[PDB]
């Protein structure tokens, strides 16, 4: 209900993984065991990539919940003067920090604080069992992270660069200008930014010193590798001093490679063995190239029983948008739910022609992709998506291929809603929503990954004046002229578009989903025919239009900034459909039954094909054209135009935003199981779908080196404390 806090009655759901794990053989279970441990180890690094006080908070909660479980601590907290409501407010906060790996929402980039008096929480922590065993370490942690745990200062509320927000990808004094200057240095030296962080210090003179730190086990000492050690030196780029170092998250990544080497023994085949071998070299040396060679082998391993991927992958939480956050997952293939996605792959090449742009802007060769539905056993990091299109390396997607994944047992969690909280919808459309939101979601996921992220040709010029296309015959469908802009060497998608790169691509993918959901052949693949085939279409469009209005929750007017890539992408689509007008979609502010400001959303079912389809057809073409040519100047002019949030009539979005926030619902928390090793057999441990259940899953998550992982996080945070 209130911003920057988590509700006591927040939804918690346990991830269902019992049946998938039961199908695994003894060898595959040991394979999934060590990979899970590796992922959970590396997921701790997200704490260091979130906020300065995040590692201290985890360390404090970890110690605290070790000596006293949630039920034991309850007896203490209530005897100290806390009400049952206040204690639940602390459990929810603790579960939030665990589930996000930090005190900032992974979906919204907003700070959340405990919903209880700080003076009352101090009397509990300082009087706890963990405080009686190790007084110096508990009082030290609370002294350091106590203030920032509750502080809702305007500059602390959102993630971002400059003095506007908080980020640990960069130092405190860094701005957008520093981030762009760094990107040019990385492009010049042909070094990726996925596993790098930037720090800026000043000397007695005042000259800024830039330090690009690679994430690796090894440090300044010489190693066998010559790839990255040749780069570990001082530079001078455009007058600015640049130092390339490594050793970031070294003790943590050390834990990771230990579990990856153990998981190598139980590899199903030679591809998985070489795959894990390169990941080890990537995490020990700090080589993205090594990780790319490992990802290359991963794509070659088609249709495994235990699917997995690890490393610094997605770049959403980076305010500049090129640095990756650590994640990693282990999942079991589900043959039943994967059947429908395989049919879509069979006719994928056929559906690409239906896209609103000439074949000169599509990939040269159609590489047969692998689309599988998986049951997640483990997903470390800030959150859990519904679908992923990995790897993110643009070069690999154009010569090797890629993998599409649909997280099956995660979709079942999302498929749960009462018609009471289905806001901004008429009661007539409420029923149609519930009956089809489930099935129509599967359609949108498939197109978003396979035909959305999977389509696109990037024009690249070689080191010499050699293009990967025919300049003499390729004509721009919007201007009519020949191509006069392209990508160069080192320049990637995230390199040029940066701050909009993520949201731009998700919007181009979501649009493909809506555009190709009209095709009857696609609906037949999911088994939707006749009137039902029309109903899944209307809902797929109704959900999109509604989501565009609900996206105002994730926009900050004072900074004119979007905090969520997908939500911004859905607001843009809403604006495009409004641009067409003709009564296709209207947002009317009304009054709720509770006597509070509310709104309603009308979507004309008939004008979808005659007005909506041509609207997306133009928009999708303009998106792809400015993307393929790397026309960033034009791309921002287009995207940041529709992304503009104003109080202009008749929509008045800024006024609606206060209505969206007034009637918003917090995102569900998800509890993941733990795998235990009984010497001979591997068993699965499940937990309660509650705040206390989520806490217990992390208390039993690191049995061997629990207290050790706390000291490591405290160490690494204390070292870089001067940066913030």
């Amino acid at each position: 209900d209130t911003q920057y806090i988590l509700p006591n009655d927040i939804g918690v759901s346990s991830l269902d993984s019992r049946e998938a794990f039961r199908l695994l053989s003894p060898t595959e279970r040991l394979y999934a065991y060590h990979l899970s441990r590796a992922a959970w180890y590396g997921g701790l690094a997200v704490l260091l990539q979130t906020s300065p006080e995040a590692p201290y908070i985890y360390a404090l909660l970890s110690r605290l919940f070790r000596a006293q479980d949630p039920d034991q601590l309850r007896q203490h907290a209530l005897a100290e003067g806390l009400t049952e409501e206040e204690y639940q407010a602390f459990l929810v906060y603790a579960a939030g920090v665990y589930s996000n790996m930090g005190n900032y929402k992974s979906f919204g980039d907003t700070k959340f604080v405990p919903n209880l008096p700080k003076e009352k929480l101090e009397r509990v922590i300082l009087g706890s069992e963990a405080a009686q065993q190790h007084p110096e370490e508990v009082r030290g942690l609370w002294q350091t992270c106590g203030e920032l745990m509750f502080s809702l200062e305007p500059r602390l509320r959102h993630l971002g660069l400059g003095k506007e927000g908080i980020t640990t990808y960069f130092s405190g004094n860094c701005t957008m200008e520093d981030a762009k200057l760094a990107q040019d240095f990385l492009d010049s030296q042909n070094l990726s930014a996925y596993n790098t962080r930037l720090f800026k210090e000043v000397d007695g003179c005042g000259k800024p010193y830039y330090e690009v730190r690679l994430a690796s086990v090894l440090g300044s000492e010489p190693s066998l590798d010559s790839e990255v050690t040749s780069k570990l030196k001082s530079y001078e780029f455009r007058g600015s001093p640049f130092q390339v170092t490594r050793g970031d998250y070294a003790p943590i990544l050390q834990k990771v490679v230990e579990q990856l080497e153990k998981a190598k023994a139980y590899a199903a085949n030679s591809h998985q063995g070489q795959m894990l071998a390169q990941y080890i070299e990537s995490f020990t040396q700090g080589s993205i190239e090594a990780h790319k060679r490992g990802s290359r082998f991963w794509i070659q391993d088609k249709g495994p029983i235990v699917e997995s991927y690890i490393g610094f992958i997605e770049s959403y939480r980076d305010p500049f948008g090129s640095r990756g956050e650590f994640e990693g997952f282990v999942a079991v293939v589900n043959k039943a739910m994967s059947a429908k996605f395989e049919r879509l792959v069979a006719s994928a090449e056929q559906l690409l022609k239906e896209l609103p742009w000439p074949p000169t802007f599509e990939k040269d060769k159609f590489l047969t992709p692998d689309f599988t539905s998986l049951d997640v056993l483990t997903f470390a990091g800030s959150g859990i998506p519904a679908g992923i299109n990995i790897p993110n390396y643009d070069d690999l997607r154009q010569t090797e291929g890629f993998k599409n994944v649909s997280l099956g047992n995660v979709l079942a969690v999302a498929y749960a809603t009462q018609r009471e909280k289905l806001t901004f919808l008429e009661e007539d459309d409420k029923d149609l929503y519930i009956l089809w939101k489930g099935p129509s979601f599967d359609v949108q996921v498939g197109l978003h990954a396979l035909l959305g992220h999977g389509s696109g040709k990037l024009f690249v010029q070689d080191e010499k004046g050699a293009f990967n296309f025919d300049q003499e015959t390729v004509i721009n469908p919007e201007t009519g002229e020949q191509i006069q802009s392209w990508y160069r060497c080192g320049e990637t998608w995230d390199s040029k578009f940066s701050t909009i790169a993520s949201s731009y691509e998700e919007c181009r993918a979501e649009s493909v989903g809506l555009y190709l959901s009209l095709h009857p052949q696609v609906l037949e693949i999911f088994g939707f025919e006749g009137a039902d085939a029309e109903d899944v279409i209307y809902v797929n469009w109704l959900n999109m239009v509604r989501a565009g209005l609900l996206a105002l929750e994730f926009y900050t007017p004072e900074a004119f900034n979007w905090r969520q890539a997908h939500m911004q992408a859905r607001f843009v689509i809403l604006r495009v459909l409004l641009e067409a007008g003709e009564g296709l979609v209207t947002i009317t502010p009304t009054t709720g039954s509770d006597g509070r400001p509310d709104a309603r959303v009308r979507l004309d079912r008939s004008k979808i094909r005659s007005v909506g389809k041509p609207a997306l057809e133009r928009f999708l073409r303009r998106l792809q054209v400015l993307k393929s040519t790397g026309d960033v100047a034009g791309g921002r002019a287009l995207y940041e135009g529709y992304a503009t949030v104003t109080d202009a009539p008749p929509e008045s979005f800024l006024t609606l935003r206060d209505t969206v926030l007034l009637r918003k619902e917090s995102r569900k928390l998800i509890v993941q199981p733990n795998t235990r090793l009984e010497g001979s057999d591997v068993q699965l441990l499940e937990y309660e779908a509650s705040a206390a259940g989520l806490i217990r899953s992390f208390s039993e998550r690191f049995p061997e080196d629990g207290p050790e992982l706390e000291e490591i996080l405290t160490q690494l945070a204390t070292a870089d404390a001067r940066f913030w």
Partner: peptide, 5 residues
């Protein structure tokens, strides 16, 4: 990349 729930 990613598609959320």
């Amino acid at each position: 990349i990613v598609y959320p729930w």
